[PDB]
Every structure is written in structure tokens, then in C-alpha cells.
RNA sequence: UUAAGAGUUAAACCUAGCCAACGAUCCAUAAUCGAUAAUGAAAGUUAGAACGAUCACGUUGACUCUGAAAUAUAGUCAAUAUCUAUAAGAUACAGCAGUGAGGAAUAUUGGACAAUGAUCGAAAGAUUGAUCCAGUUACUUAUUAGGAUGAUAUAUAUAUAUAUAUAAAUUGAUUAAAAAUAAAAUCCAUAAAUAAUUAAAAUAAUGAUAUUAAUUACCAUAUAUUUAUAUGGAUAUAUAUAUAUUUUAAUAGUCCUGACUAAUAUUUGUGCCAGCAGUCGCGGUAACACAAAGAGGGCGAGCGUUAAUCA
């Protein structure tokens, strides 16, 4: 069934501001409704048009939120500035002797 | 499977399971099997050809050799060990189908299993390979039972040529009935071994041109109606079903009405229960086959070396 | 008979027959060697594969195609 | 393929199950019997002689065997907390139910292997016993044939 | 998950009809690899149903085949199972509610029976 | 010594003479032709022994050796008709006793090469109701009816099962007009018989759970998938089976 | 010295021993094995790809720290080979794809962490070429790859063996010489499509596979036990309602026919040539063996052949 939205996260367009990972450009996709946002499974999220990652976060965020568990962006994991662990001895060697 | 070619060719004289008129012919004309003046690999390759050609023929050659079973099962008269060669064989649906009188042939029990016509235990099977149990519950659809085991249905242009000739010979007799009721009253009671209102009650039929009735059906439905043939064209009752609708038997079926001893065949509901897989008792063996202990022996030899 | 000393890729010399009605094998021409003596040659245990290489399938193959490397 | 037939006919392998005890209870008599009973002296037995000395740096007699005390086992593997009362705490109360249930199953687990174990010796023993009564048996059978002793001699006796 | 002996699930099958084997295995050992002991098997597949099954009321059936004598005593010594594993602990009444997790957790349709 | 033998009658008939040139017949087709006798303006072929099914509960199975190829009867008078040298269809010079005088044996024996091959008898509608009655209003064992009848217990079983059957379809009017002609010819085309444990846990169930886990006991060492078992799907010795919906699965 | 025995290593002092024609030492070769694969009646024999167990290695050799355990895919040193950053630098794809060479010959520079595992984190969660899926490849194995009927066209006039005419009739052949029920034609189906719906792999939620499998040919419900008749939403029609209610197929190669060794219906070209051949062997007008036609016999999405293994 569907959550009442909150103050906190007014609109549709709030909570994929809030949730991140470039979820902002899927706007046109859902038209601003919460009844549409909380009862599209994966199955019309893929026919619509958003990728596999894209729906799998959003239905995952949409179960938090129903679940009430927090919903911020989680910032996916990045490779070291210096480069991956097989790769860091190299990088580390090029980048001190060149500055 | 292998495609069905040249399985009533008269020339090979080849005996088929299935109820074909030429099949018919040609198990009527083989007289037996000849292993005379042959040598042993001749002898062995000529018991193959026949009983492949008969048992499984649909089956490839290396696929039988897998299902293949070296070993007999059975139960004073000398027992048939050896016409157990091909028992295997009849645990498959396709063979219960065509043992049960529900098929015309092997391959026809398999098209019906295919199509999704046959159920075993109330589950739909469309596997031919399906391999039955002893207990086993297994249906046909009525409609393909009776298609099977009855006559063709003629097209409306045949029928209606058929009726053609049936008005004409009806008019033929009317005639000679109403010149001469005497002789034709003698000759009706010589072949059973007087009223003249009799053959006033004869009437003739009009004779019907097919050029301009050709195309509609109700309409000959209607002018064609003869004291047998009342109000429909010849074997088209009620052209809906996929039969001879005045439903008669298909033609020479009583030469392979054969009622299996591993089966039991209720024929109202087209439905069989698979008693056992078949055995061989003193004097009597469960495998149909039209060929003799020897040929089978000959297959078996041929079939534990695998032709070596 | 029409055969041809041939050097494989592993060094050895070999002599082998050349089967069919025609062939077009000449000197540095690249074929394929298999098993199989010419009974009536001594010395000859190889044949070369028609269809394989530089030589060609024999011209016009009605029968046993397969053997010739004729293709229809 | 083959070998299987030794096998039951079973292709493939599982792991070989491991023995709750690794040592002989102190509960089986007829172990510990066996193992204290006096070693076949010479050489059909497993022990060095009397007057023969051993190598310097070794020992004359193997390792006793650890007879492990169920009992002892249970308490020391697995003991019961002293300090029975606390208060609330969230996670404390999961680690308590959690524990407690680990301690059922191991003292259960090890309770009913020892029991199995004896209920083998005594199944044996029934076998045998009942193996030695026949015996017993056939001894009332052949007097039967021999009472009827004419004590002439016989060629079937020669 | 901890530990260096793990009560988890090991693949067996074909491709896109999985089974499994409930085993008890060494966690730096490969996850078809030759395990210590294998407690059981596990088909995910639930059993079909017909439509008239269905109005029957019967409900799909997933099977499980397990060692519950020797789970519960790799379970005494310090063996810890998968998530999965959990699961299909608990729903068997070999492990209790304090297994839980918050995601994991209602209304009760059928309890769980004992019978032989 | 071995060679193709074209499959010709082993019973005398007559070859094909001098042909017009645009025949393009053979011997086996006139063979065929003279066993099947004249074709009809329906297409039927009324002077052939076989061609009607009987009707006296005897089966009419061929006997070309008996008959030495001469299949041909008047439909009516059913009495034989060879082939004569003006073309007609007429009476024969000698009756062959051998049609006159044929075995019990041999007339439920439905291929002439083998003996052994014979037709099973066909169990009266009667009896398979006295037996229905029997077994399931009196509670008679299969074991007491299968004495009693001179019948087999499978046998009996199936013919429970099937009468139960045939009174569904007849509660539920699915014994057509067609079935019932298609019944009783095949009845009269055969002879008639003449009577004289391991600990199991349900899972528990919650609502929005679409399945109930069932436990099996088992013993270690016994249950499992065994570790390096041999691979028979790319062996003819592959394994295959059928699923409880019926579809085809590898075991 | 080790946690630990021992010429295992290091030192010292004694004895003269130890192995070996039932094969030492040396050389060549080789990863080993199974409840794995092949084969055989079996003993055995072969393989060690695939599934599984053990070992060894991560370009080559030695040593060192840490550690319970490493001569570690670590570090140091050197050897080889490359790249730049020219430094008491980095890298070595026997990790996944992929490229070049070698070879008769062995694929995607793919999708996802949905499932099962693994690492980190208290958790939220993050990573995962392990793994799972898909791609290529008849490399192998299995199911399908359509059944029944069917030897001719017209014209005549409660019975029923309908009979007469004419016309045609492909290849071979003049009757046991056939191709051939093979074709055509007819009857009845289903696959595919087109529509709806729709599981399961997974649940608290998350599905890569996915244009999912499966079901029905309008859709539900309402009773009976899959087939029925009903009630209601579809449906064009004609004139709410009598009616019907998507469409629909067919698609085989390859070898051989003197004997071993299954293949009789016969002919043509060549002429010890061209050629065939596993063995015997055939080919000089009369070729069952060469190259073909007809017919025929095997296996069949395979067939043959070469290389091997067992018998
Ligand atoms: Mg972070
Ligand atoms: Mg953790
Ligand atoms: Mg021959
Ligand atoms: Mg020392
Ligand atoms: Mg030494
Ligand atoms: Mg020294
Ligand atoms: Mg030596
Ligand atoms: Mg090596
Ligand atoms: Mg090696
Ligand atoms: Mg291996
Ligand atoms: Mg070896
Ligand atoms: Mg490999
Ligand atoms: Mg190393
Ligand atoms: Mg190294
Ligand atoms: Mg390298
Ligand atoms: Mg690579
Ligand atoms: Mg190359
Ligand atoms: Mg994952
Ligand atoms: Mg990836
Ligand atoms: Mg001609
Ligand atoms: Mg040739
Ligand atoms: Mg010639
Ligand atoms: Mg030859
Ligand atoms: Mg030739
Ligand atoms: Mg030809
Ligand atoms: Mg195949």
C-alpha cells in the first residue's frame, strides 16, 4: 500500500533528488505521481525505460521508505586515487617521480 | 525420428504397425520369413530388417541399440523367450496408443501425443518417448480415437459425385421395380434365400447437376434425400467432426483388431490401463508380432553384438 | 601413378598419393597429409586430401564427392 | 565406472563423517579391558621382552589411550554461566538464547553418541552369545546320533 | 559470514536447475569443493501445482533432506550458517527466533508439525 | 549366397501379360488389385474377405496360406469368388477344405507366421459391473474376485478404474452417439470371456508466503550429491525423465 | 638447531660398512589417482580432457622478514624480456575477455552481482571476470523435424458385387522389371506467428537470464467432477442479439552394392589407360570392382575418412 509522504520528502521529485546516483534524470518517467512511484514493480520500470541499475536501486529505496529505514545516497565504491591495489605500485612509482 | 519413406513399398514387402490397406497387402502376401541357403550374418541382418521394420521403426538404429535390453522377462508348451526381443518397446506411450486400437498406426499415436491429445493419470503428455509403468491410467481425446478408427470423411465434390451415382442407381431400380414387380420380387426373395401397392410406393429422385450446386453445401444438404440418405450428403452427416460422421469402421480393420494381453481397453471413454509390461508364458507370448520365435532369435543375436 | 614428395610441418619427408582423376599439385604448393598406404607403391604409406590447401577437388565429381572434395 | 560395483553401484564420494569422540568413552568396558589387559608376551604379541633392552631415546610402551570422560568433556567444553543474574540488554538476550541452545545440542549431541556406542557393545554381545548357544546347539544334536554307540569300530571313526 | 567452519550451501546441478547441498565446509575452500560433511540437499524449486490443486488449497512444496542430529551438533560446536542456511534452520525449528535479523523481521497461516 | 528378393506372392496369381506401352504397371499391383478385388464408385472394395469387420464375436483375421490368395467373397452370400480368364469374379471348381476345416487355435491367432501371437478375450459389460459391485459395495479384495472370475489382480484393478471412469463420463454425458457405435463394433470383433519411518517437519506458514518447506530426516554419509559422480549427459547412457507437470527434465 | 626423530643441515670423534642380475647407479620419459571416462564376458588394458581428491608451479635461480605454517604470485639480489617516469623505477595475463606465433585443431576484448559463496564494515551497505547467465562452435548427447487417405478423367440411364462407353496414361521394360503409394489430389492436425495472460528460480525487498517457461485461443464466475450447461463484460452483423468469434505450415544429407559385407532391373563410357583398393584383388571390348545412368542397401543431422584406445 502506499506511504503518506512526508514533510520531509514532499514529492517524487524530492525523493529522487534525495536517493542520488543520477536518479534525477528518471523524473519524466514517473510524472511527479507517488501512487505510480510505490506500486511499479520491475517489470514496468524496465519497460519504461530505466536500466537494471536504476530500477533495482529505486525499488530498493522505495522498500526502505516503506520500511521507514533511512534513504540517503549511498556512494558507490570507487577505485583508490592512486589506482587499484594490482595496479597501485606502478601509479604510485609514476606519479612521485613525475611530481 | 527418422521420415516416414517408402513404409509400404510392395516391392520390399515390409510389414509396418499400422492399419494401411497396403500394409495389409503386404503382410498378406509375405508368406514368412526365408532363412534358407543364407549364411549366418545373412540370416541375422534379414531378422533385423524385418522386425526393425516392424518393431520401432520410427527409432533410429543407434538409439534402439541404447534402449536396447540384453535381458528377458517372463512368467507343458516350449515358453517364447527370445519374442521378448522388442517387449521393451512396448512401454512407450506411442505403442500403448496404437496396441490400445486408439491409432491407426505407431506414427499417428505419436502425432496424437505430440498434439497434445493424450493424457496419462489426468497430466497431459507430449513426450512419445513417455515411458509407462505397470498400473498406469493413460486417455485419448474421443475425437482423434474415432478419427483414427473410422472411416475418411469424403469432400463436399466427392460426396456429391457419390450421391450422383446414388440417385441414378435409385432411379434404375425404381424403374425395373415398377416395369416388372414380378421378377423383381422373385429375385429379392431368392436372395433373402405379393402386394402391387409395393412398388407404388417406389418414387423416383431427381437427378441433381453438380455445375450449378457446386459451393453450397445446406442447399444440397436439402434437394439430396434418398430412404437411407435422408437430408445429407454421402459420409457428411454433420461436416463439423474430423470423420466419416454416420460413423462405420475404416476399412480392413478386422485383420489387425488384435486386443493386447498387457492392456486393459475401455473403448467408450477411449481410456486403457497399462496392466504390465508383456511376458512370455509356455506357448504364448504378450509381444505382438507377425514374425516367428527364429526371426526374433536372429534379431536378439544380431542386437547383443550390435551387428558384429 | 601420381604421387609427391611432401616436407611437413614437423620435418619429416614423406611420399604421398596424389588420388582422383585430376590434380593440379606443383612444387611448393601447400597440402594436407594423411594416413593411408598406395598398396601398389612401395614406399608410399600417405595420401593427400583432395579439397584441402592448394590442391583442389577433382573436376566434375559425381560420386563420393565427399571423398574428392567436389562440392554440389 | 567399475569400481563402483565394490561401491553399491554409487558413482562419486562423500566426505568421510567425522566421530564426535575422537577417543574411547570410559563408559566401554570391553575397550578399556582389552587395553589393560595383559600384552601377548613374544613375538605373536606387540611388546618388547623382559630381558631385551630398548633404543635409548625411546619408548618401550606406546601412548596411553585417553579415555575420555563424557562428563568431564561436557563440563569443561561447554559450562554453564555462574553469574545467572543480569539486566535488560538487547543484544545480551540473543547471545543468551543463542548460547544456551549451542550448549543443549553439544551436551545432547555427545549424551547420545556415548549411548550409541554402548548399545553397539551390547548388541555384540547378544550376537556372540547367542552364536555360542548354537554351538550348544549342535552339541545336543550329535549325542543324540551317539548314543546309539555299539563301541565297535567304524571306518567313518578310523 | 565468521568462522572458519561455515554451514552453507554448496551448487550442484545443471545450468538454470539448481540444487543444492547443505554442508558443512572449511570458508577458504571453494564452494563446490569437497566439503566436511554434507548435512543434506535442498531443491529451491517449489512442487507444481494444478489450478484444481489450487482451489483445493494446497500450497507449493520446497524439499529439504537434512542430518538434523549431526546439524544440531556442528551447530554446538562453533559452526555458523549462511544466511540461507539460517533460514532453512529456522523454519525447520532447528534454530530459534534469536537467528533473526531486522530485515528479516506475519500473521501465522500454518504452524510448524512434527510427524513421522 | 543372398540377394534382393522382391517381396512377390508365394501364392499362385496371374502375371501380367503382353502391356500396352503406356501401362507402366508392375506384377505386385495387379497382385494387389486381384487380393483387394473391384474398387466401388464410393471406393470401397466389397468382394474382399476382410474389408467388413465381424460381427458374430469372432475375429476374422487373414489366413492367406489357407485360402492359397483367393480373398474374394461374394459380400452377401459370403461365398468365394475367384478370378476367372473371361475377368469375372466366379464360383471356384473345388472348395478348399482347409477353410472348412480350420482350428479353434487358429482363428484367434491374428498373423499366420506366428503361433504364439494370439488375441486376448474381451470382458463383457456385465462382468465388469459384477465386478465394480463386487469390489467396491461388498469390499471383495482384488485377490477373492480374481479367484472367483479366473482373472488376474491388475486386471481387476484396472477394470474398477475403468468403470468408475465410464460412470463419470456417463454422469457427465461425454459417451457420445459416435463412442457408443465405435464400442460396441470393436466388442463384437473379439471373443468374449466366459466367467466359468522417518521424521518429517511442515514448516511453519505465513501469510505472503507462497510455499511450505518440507524436512526429511536423513542419515550423514547417505544423504547428499556425490562429489565427482560420473557425467552421462554428453553419453548415450544419459538420463531422462518426466516432471510432475509432465515435461521432459534430465535426472 | 626445531615444537619434534633422524648424517636433514653445521661441528667433533669412532667403526667399515650400505645398495645391487628379484636389476643398484646412470640415462630417457612422465604430474598422480578415484565410487571419473573408454573398452572387454571378465582378469585386466588405455586416458588422467570433463566431475572430484593430492601435489607442484604463477617468467628463471638463491636467500631473508613476517608468521603457527612461505625459500610466499611478498621483499632483496641477480638472470631474461620489455616499457618510461631514467629511478637503491615498473611490468612479466599458466585470473577473465582478447591479440600474435605454433598447430590438423579448441570460442566473447559479453550481462549481472538476481541466486550460491568470499572480503570489509557495528550496521546501512560496498567490492567480487569466484559464481551465475548469455554469445560462438553439430565437439558430444537427447527430443522434435506431419499423420490418415490416395493409382486416372469425363458421358449415359431401405436399395445396395452398379454396368457400360470413350479418352488419356512420365522414366525403364514386355512380365515375376520395376521406379511407385512414390507423386498429385483429398481429410485432419499441430509448430511458428498474432493476441491476451503468466509462474518459478527469492523473497522483507532485490530477476542478469528475459522478446522467461507454461496455459487459452475472446474474458471472467458458478456448480459438477479435464469435460459440460448456465450468469455477466467482449463481438461485427443484420435487425439490446438468432448468429459466429486470429491464422496456420513442412523442411536431408553422406557412404556403398565381386567376396569378407547388407545391396539381381538392368545399361552406357573406358580399354592393364584413366583409375579403384582395409585384405583377396579389378581394369587388354563381355568391367557386378574404374567414371556414370537406372534400380537397390546402410547410417541419418549427420555420413565418410584419417589419427588413436579397448576387444
Ligand atoms: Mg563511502
Ligand atoms: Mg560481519
Ligand atoms: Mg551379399
Ligand atoms: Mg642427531
Ligand atoms: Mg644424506
Ligand atoms: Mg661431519
Ligand atoms: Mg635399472
Ligand atoms: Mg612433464
Ligand atoms: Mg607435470
Ligand atoms: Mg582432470
Ligand atoms: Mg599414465
Ligand atoms: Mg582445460
Ligand atoms: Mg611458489
Ligand atoms: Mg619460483
Ligand atoms: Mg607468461
Ligand atoms: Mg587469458
Ligand atoms: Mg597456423
Ligand atoms: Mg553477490
Ligand atoms: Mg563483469
Ligand atoms: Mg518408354
Ligand atoms: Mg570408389
Ligand atoms: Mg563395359
Ligand atoms: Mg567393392
Ligand atoms: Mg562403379
Ligand atoms: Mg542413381
Ligand atoms: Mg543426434
Known sequence: ???????????????????????????????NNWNNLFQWDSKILKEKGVNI?????????????????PIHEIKLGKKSFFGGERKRKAFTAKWKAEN | PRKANLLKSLARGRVRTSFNKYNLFNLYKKGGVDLKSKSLYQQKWTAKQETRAYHGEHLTEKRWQTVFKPKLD??????????????????????????????????????????GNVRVNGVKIKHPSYTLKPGDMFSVKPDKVLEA?????????????????????????????????????????????????????????????????????????????????????????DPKKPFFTPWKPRPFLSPFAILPHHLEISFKTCHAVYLRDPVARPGQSEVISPFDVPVHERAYMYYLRNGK | RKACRVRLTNGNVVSAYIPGEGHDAQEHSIVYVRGGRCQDLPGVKYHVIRGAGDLSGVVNRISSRSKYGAKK | GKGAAKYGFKSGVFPTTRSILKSPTTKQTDIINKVKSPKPKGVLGIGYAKGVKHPKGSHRLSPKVNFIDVDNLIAKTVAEPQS???????????????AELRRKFLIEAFRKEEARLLHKHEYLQKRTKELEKAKELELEKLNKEKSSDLTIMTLDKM | ????????????????????????????????????????????????????????????????????????????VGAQPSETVTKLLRKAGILNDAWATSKNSRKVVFERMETL | FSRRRIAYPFYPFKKLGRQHPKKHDTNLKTAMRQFLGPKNY????????????????????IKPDLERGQSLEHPVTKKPLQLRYDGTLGPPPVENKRLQNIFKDRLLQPFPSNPHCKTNYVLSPQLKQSIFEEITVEGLSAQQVSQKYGLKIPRVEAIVKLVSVENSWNRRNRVSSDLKTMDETLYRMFPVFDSDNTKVIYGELVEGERSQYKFTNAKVGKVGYRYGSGNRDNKKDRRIGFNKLGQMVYI
Not at chain 1, 529505486?58 to 521507514?68: A, T
Not at chain 2, 421378377?183 to 434365400?193: A, R, S
Open chain 1, 1 to 31: 500500500t502506499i506511504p503518506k509522504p512526508s514533510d520531509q520528502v514532499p514529492d517524487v521529485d524530492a525523493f529522487l533528488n534525495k536517493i542520488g546516483r543520477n536518479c534525477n534524470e528518471l523524473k519524466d518517467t514517473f510524472e
Open chain 1, 53 to 69: 541499475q536504476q530500477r533495482k536501486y529505486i525499488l530498493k529505496q522505495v522498500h526502505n521508505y516503506r520500511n521507514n529505514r
Open chain 2, 74 to 115: 517372463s512368467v507343458i508348451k516350449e515358453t517364447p523367450f527370445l519374442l521378448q526381443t522388442f517387449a521393451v518397446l512396448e512401454k512407450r506411450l506411442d505403442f500403448a496408443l496404437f496396441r490400445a486400437m486408439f491409432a491407426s498406426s505407431v506414427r499417428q499415436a505419436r502425432q496424437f501425443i505430440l498434439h
Open chain 2, 149 to 237: 478408427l473410422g472411416a475418411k470423411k469424403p469432400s463436399f465434390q466427392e460426396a456429391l459425385k457419390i450421391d450422383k451415382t446414388q440417385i441414378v442407381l435409385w432411379n434404375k431400380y425404381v424403374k425395373e421395380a415398377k416395369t416388372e414387380p414380378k421378377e423383381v420380387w422373385e429375385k429379392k426373395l431368392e436372395n433373402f434365400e405379393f402386394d402391387p401397392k409395393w412398388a407404388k410406393n417406389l418414387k423416383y429422385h431427381d437427378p441433381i447437376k453438380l455445375s450449378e450446386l457446386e459451393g453450397d453445401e445446406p442447399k444440397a444438404r436439402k434437394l439430396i434425400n434418398l430412404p437411407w440418405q435422408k437430408n445429407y450428403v454421402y459420409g457428411r452427416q
Open chain 4, 84 to 98: 545467572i543474574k543480569s539486566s535488560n540488554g538487547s543484544a545480551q538476550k540473543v547471545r543468551l538464547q543463542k
Open chain 5, 1 to 76: 559470514t565468521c568462522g572458519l567452519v561455515r554451514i552453507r550451501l554448496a551448487r550442484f546441478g545443471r545450468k538454470n536447475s539448481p540444487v543444492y547441498n547443505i554442508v558443512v565446509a572449511n570458508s577458504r575452500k571453494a564452494r563446490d569443493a569437497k566439503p566436511i560433511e554434507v548435512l543434506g540437499t535442498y531443491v529451491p524449486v517449489p512442487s507444481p501445482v494444478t489450478k484444481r490443486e489450487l482451489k483445493r488449497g494446497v500450497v507449493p512444496i520446497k524439499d529439504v533432506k537434512l542430518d538434523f542430529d549431526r546439524t544440531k551438533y556442528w551447530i554446538g
Open chain 6, 42 to 61: 464410393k471406393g470401397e472394395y466389397v468382394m474382399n474377405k476382410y474389408f467388413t469387420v465381424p460381427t458374430n464375436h469372432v475375429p476374422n483375421y
